Amino acid sequence: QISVRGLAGVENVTELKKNFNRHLHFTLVKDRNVATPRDYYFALAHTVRDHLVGRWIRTQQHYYEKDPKRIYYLSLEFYMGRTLQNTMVNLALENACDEATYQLGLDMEELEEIEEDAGLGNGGLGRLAACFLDSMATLGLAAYGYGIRYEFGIFNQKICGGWQMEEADDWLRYGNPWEKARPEFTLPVHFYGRVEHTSQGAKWVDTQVVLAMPYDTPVPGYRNNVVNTMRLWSAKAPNDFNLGYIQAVLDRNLAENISRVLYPNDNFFEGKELRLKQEYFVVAATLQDIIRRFKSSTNFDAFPDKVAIQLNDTHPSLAIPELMRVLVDLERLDWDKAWEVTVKTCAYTNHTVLPEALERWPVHLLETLLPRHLQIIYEINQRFLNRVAAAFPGDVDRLRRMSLVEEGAVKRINMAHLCIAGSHAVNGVARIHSEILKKTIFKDFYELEPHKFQNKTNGITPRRWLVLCNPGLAEIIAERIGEEYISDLDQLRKLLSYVDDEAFIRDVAKVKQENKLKFAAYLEREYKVHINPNSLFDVQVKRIHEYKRQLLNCLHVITLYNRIKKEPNKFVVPRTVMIGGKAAPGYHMAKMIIKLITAIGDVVNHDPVVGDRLRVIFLENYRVSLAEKVIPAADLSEQISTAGTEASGTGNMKFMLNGALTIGTMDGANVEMAEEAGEENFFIFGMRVEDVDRLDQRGYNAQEYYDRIPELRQIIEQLSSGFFSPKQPDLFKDIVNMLMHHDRFKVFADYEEYVKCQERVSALYKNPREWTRMVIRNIATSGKFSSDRTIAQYAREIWGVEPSRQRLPA
Amino acid sequence: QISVRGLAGVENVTELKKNFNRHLHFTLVKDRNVATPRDYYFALAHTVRDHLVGRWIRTQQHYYEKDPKRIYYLSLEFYMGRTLQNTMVNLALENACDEATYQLGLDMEELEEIEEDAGLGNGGLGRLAACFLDSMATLGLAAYGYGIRYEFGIFNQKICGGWQMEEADDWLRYGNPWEKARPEFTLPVHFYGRVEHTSQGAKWVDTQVVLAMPYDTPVPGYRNNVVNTMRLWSAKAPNDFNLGYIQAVLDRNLAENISRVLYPNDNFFEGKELRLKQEYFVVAATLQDIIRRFKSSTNFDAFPDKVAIQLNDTHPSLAIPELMRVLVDLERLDWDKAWEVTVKTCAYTNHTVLPEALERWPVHLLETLLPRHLQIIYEINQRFLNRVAAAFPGDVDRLRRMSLVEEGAVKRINMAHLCIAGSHAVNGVARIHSEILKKTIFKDFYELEPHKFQNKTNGITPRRWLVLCNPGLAEIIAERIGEEYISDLDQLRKLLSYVDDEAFIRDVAKVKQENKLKFAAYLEREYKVHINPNSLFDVQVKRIHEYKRQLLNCLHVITLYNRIKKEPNKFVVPRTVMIGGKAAPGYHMAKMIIKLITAIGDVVNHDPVVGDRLRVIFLENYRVSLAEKVIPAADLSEQISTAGTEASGTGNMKFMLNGALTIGTMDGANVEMAEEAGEENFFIFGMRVEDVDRLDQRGYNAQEYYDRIPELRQIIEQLSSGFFSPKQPDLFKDIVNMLMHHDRFKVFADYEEYVKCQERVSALYKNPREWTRMVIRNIATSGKFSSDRTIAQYAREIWGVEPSRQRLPA
Ligand SMILES: O=C(NC(=O)c1cc2ccccc2[nH]1)N[C@@H]1O[C@H](CO)[C@@H](O)[C@H](O)[C@H]1O
Ligand SMILES: O=C(NC(=O)c1cc2ccccc2[nH]1)N[C@@H]1O[C@H](CO)[C@@H](O)[C@H](O)[C@H]1O
């Protein structure tokens, strides 16, 4: 149908049809008489999967022959989403499969909706890992993603009586065609025990053993015949575990619980033992795998020349002391040499400056679970602090600030401090964030070792986030500038010479309208909710957090409602306000915010005077597959975090690429997005980082804003009096109390500028031609935010490897 | 190589080779450079599996079109063993696969040894179910085996310091190519809750739900293109289960523990809640499946015309009240009609008369777990006892004897009584056993309903137990009488005209010698134990039980040792005495018996004066795959249970078919085996059932035998003094105490006759020609003991269906 989806050659279509029928018969044990849509999905998945095999085997043997430096990306989260369409896109099989299925009497888009998301992440950090894998394969790097195969990913969200309910994400129930179990490569992981000091160094003895069984998933590059590997570890009990008899067999569950479920708390670090076990589990199994592969190429001087380990936050930070443990205790290297190798091997990426999110493990937990690692951490700390003392003589407070060990009621290990000490490179994820790290939380470390600190601005893959989710836009771009931009996104700059092109203006607006119509139809069919497709689609989708200020959006919504009620017969630009995202199960305030959004909808959506001029919808179960639907449909992207709190954001980049305009603060990557597009093409409002600092020095008094802004006062009175909860008048008392007395994120301080800025959005939307021209200026300058750019920078500036767009033979 | 293994056609071999290579590549994601023997096994399994698919689909659609009466075989145990060779045998693919693999540079026999046994049973009862499935498919019956997919089967046995150690049988670790998961056919099973009595009958409410997910395994008939199904249920938690958050997800393990492990206690009924859950789990899921299939052919009058349910012991006895529950509470049938349907549908097979093995469930357990079923059981009991009272007026003691409810400290439900009341047919498993049921434990029930009581003598499948395990014997038989005997075992009678045939005598002896050489080589390679292949192979393999009298065998072994020590320079017929079998983990005496056997070996095997004249070996980890190796190698089959205790035995039949002579009591099927072969061709010794009864009336005094038999006295003195345990002199005090004071199975009473009979065995073995002639007379009369005969009798006399050897189109 469309060019970017590839060729549907007669020979290919014929072969796909027969292989589909072969799998339906031999693999699924079904015929066309009893087969269901799910059976058809699986037949197609197996058919497409077959095309990966040759490339997967030959990519891996190519790495063995050429022996390049290997990149190991360690993460507790990989937010992959669906695999079928992405695989077809990267193999140029989409049109051929569409034709093959069509000739068999099937709708491929219907089959695609059957696949479960691989939801092995919470949000941004997990999705970044996924985009990175796609980019590393596209750029021909010898890269491996290592993580945990959770039996249950991020919970499915149900909304019941306006409240979030959590249900288990049983994503493996029907099987996973994309993984290959590798039981033959199972490795042991050790826990508990004790340290014995002998004549020839320390020995870690009397341990309990859990087995790590790998499952491999192919990661195809974009049309370069490269297929890399994501290896996820699953926990298995040894066969003599607990070996009255029945109970011993049942108790195997305790060991296997390590890989059972993803921790869904992305707001607040909780020092839970099971989480610590998960972190060591992935680190210990992965490092054994790395060392084995290195030995199968005695001398560890060349280790950092052949191995790079990237730590996705501090979650896999135990890699540092584990590598030291193996090198010192098992390989018998001297400490100084092992440390040199470790530092040159490891690099650390930070994703937030919020203090409550930072990992600070109680010493007593590490003492019991990982006694040798604690001893190694203590030794690292002493040697590090001796360096600090030598560089800054007499600065005793610096010594306590920089220590890996934090004193207090309970002693804790600061895992970020461990990561900085043990890595040759530390990076933030957007320019402003990286600067904040050097000026604030890691200031002391920057002063000691300035060369370690870098920036790597985040990005998104244009395969999933344009070609896959928005083929209509990809095609109209391809018609003008060709197909090369898909792996070279900077080429989008060529679209600037089309800003006054009448045909292109019409085509861009048409694609958006089609996407909006499709999403409006999705909402009616799956949820029975009615929306006006002609309204401005105002979208805020992301995890629910106070710092992300969904509450500020709520205040604007109520403002618009109140203004309509005051002047009913005055024209306003119609809006559909959509808010979606999951709340961490133990985050009370976030759960209250969800209830508020639904409560506002209950009032607004049923007011006859409002009509179709304002609609408020909570998008249930926001996840990767839903993002792929809603982002192409969006007109306005809400990126409204308090300046200095969102490290980067990546949803922002997805919206920019797909033809939405952005209303945002100068926070995270918003700054660079505005820099690329031009400030005149961005709806920028509110306090800058410097303004927040000034307010903190003075003291934030929310009462001041309440007293001076009548429209804000009305909203607070409505919330407190029970206007949005008639049967439970004091339901939102916690929200009001927080806003008035304990608001860390200064919601009231940005209220006036936000509402005014929103008025300017509505003004521009009244002029469809000028709206679309500004959209074109955004899409055309989105090139910097390709994860291909991000990965090329990691490769050149941290890992010491050169990317390549050269094809492997098919 | 050999005729019975089929043709190796050029076209077939070529196609098998290419499909092997296709699976190694696409399915296993390997090439010949990195593939291991295990990978090669899996490639072959997938290749052979492909040949089942068409036949499996067309068999099932054939049953849908013809709509014959369906047979449902309900069992908690299916002892299947390995599947690869059996599938090849039944599809006539063995020679072709042998050639295909040979041309690829692989030894098929080496690949076959990689497959894990499906050890989903304890012994005889579980293996009977497996042989029955094979026979039902071979006889063209529309039959379904229903059971539980245990994650862990019967434990692997390790011998450490002479003691049994148990380790988990993790049989699914590398995957199971023979099962097809059917998640789409998942059904709910209900537990706990309470009964509510409304205007329109009882309702079972407030239950907890566990899901039953089926896995289907193909059961191929012998070269008739029939492929039936074994459906095994796996336990799954519902997605809202327990739905702080983390714990709720982890707690899903509690529901899923239902299908975790096979109970290994085959000696003593233990009223454990988890076992009760397993029994209801299989019954509830199965009956829903049956009713659904019946409705997809309103009127349940035709139910017994279309459905037969066979209960393998009382383990699935809850089928009776569950069927009543569905018919009365859900379908709204009146009680009397539902009861008529139930009785005509169900039949019960008993497997033991030992009181401690009979299921007697505490009422309090059923009250809590299955409150509606208990109410139904009470109603069944009242109506049944009203019938007893009408037939035998004034016989008050008969009423308490026949009650389903047993009074005492704790009230219990006798599940055997439930089965008899609710079944139209009750059978024992050998003629003597069936007679014992009518004269003793079920005497009252036989007097009330004599027409219900039947015999169905057990059998074994000649596919697994001759063609598969002993191809050399199968071939020499086939050379004389053709191939038809494999599905018509009565044809073996034709071999009687070869008893004086010099060529056949030589061929039978040669095959035995080859089998003995092969097994002697197996013992050296896998266990490093040395045996003399020229010695008489004296074998007792079966689960360790006091009633099976491994201890009597032990006494004979020590007798032979003592006689050698007394007269060292006298010739004795050399023997290798092999004893193998698992003990239930909580059966102390059985564990002591294993230790005794190894302790005897430790003394006997290292005595220089003995030399190679006597060797005692404990065969570790006895299981189906090991039985297939040792049985063909055996000269003497030990079947020495106390008369009246072994219901049938089936190991006895396996040995008879494979050219061993039998030393045995007149117990179980031994009686019929001796009847078929002629008593002159069997080594029969010891008390008959009548002799045991006489001794019980008088009182068994072991001291009498000890006082009157000097050779027995010596052995007891050796055991007590610490001759077989020098460092732990009183190790065997428990065994001596039991034998002297508390022996339920009268070991001493059969000692003298046993030793004398064993002397006659040795005498015959000195004459190779006459030994072999007697062997021929045994093999030639083994035909009755085909499970094809057994199943034909069940079909005609219980199920009301006619078997067929007619082929389905390929
Ligand atoms: O597709 C699958 N087929 C079989 O397991 C199967 C076909 C067949 C034919 C005859 C006899 C036995 C047979 N068995 N299995 C799925 O293969 C998926 C993709 O690898 C797995 O994720 C999933 O766990 C597994 O259920
Ligand atoms: O997604 C992020 N963090 C987590 O998911 C997270 C789970 C967790 C568990 C325990 C302790 C800490 C934890 N954190 N950070 C995002 O990471 C994205 C990728 O850099 C950024 O764009 C975005 O600004 C940032 O908020």
Ligand SMILES: O=C(NC(=O)c1cc2ccccc2[nH]1)N[C@@H]1O[C@H](CO)[C@@H](O)[C@H](O)[C@H]1O
């Ligand atoms: O044989 C199997 N192959 C795969 O799972 C597989 C091939 C492949 C190629 C590219 C990308 C992904 C891929 N995945 N799976 C086994 O299939 C067996 C037989 O059905 C199962 O018992 C067992 O659980 C399962 O591991």
Ligand SMILES: O=C(NC(=O)c1cc2ccccc2[nH]1)N[C@@H]1O[C@H](CO)[C@@H](O)[C@H](O)[C@H]1O
């Ligand atoms: O194998 C048998 N029984 C069991 O495995 C068994 C497990 C179990 C658990 C709880 C309660 C009772 C239990 N029992 N019985 C054999 O069943 C065989 C098949 O009929 C006979 O040949 C043989 O004589 C007989 O001993």
Ligand SMILES: *Cc1c(COP(=O)(O)O)cnc(C)c1O
């Ligand atoms: C991109 C993405 C995110 C990250 O969004 P931010 O707005 O940058 O926090 C979270 N969840 C999903 C499903 C995503 O796709």
Ligand SMILES: *Cc1c(COP(=O)(O)O)cnc(C)c1O
């Ligand atoms: C046949 C068989 C049995 C039953 O043997 P009996 O001697 O009849 O108790 C037990 N275990 C296995 C593995 C068998 O094959």
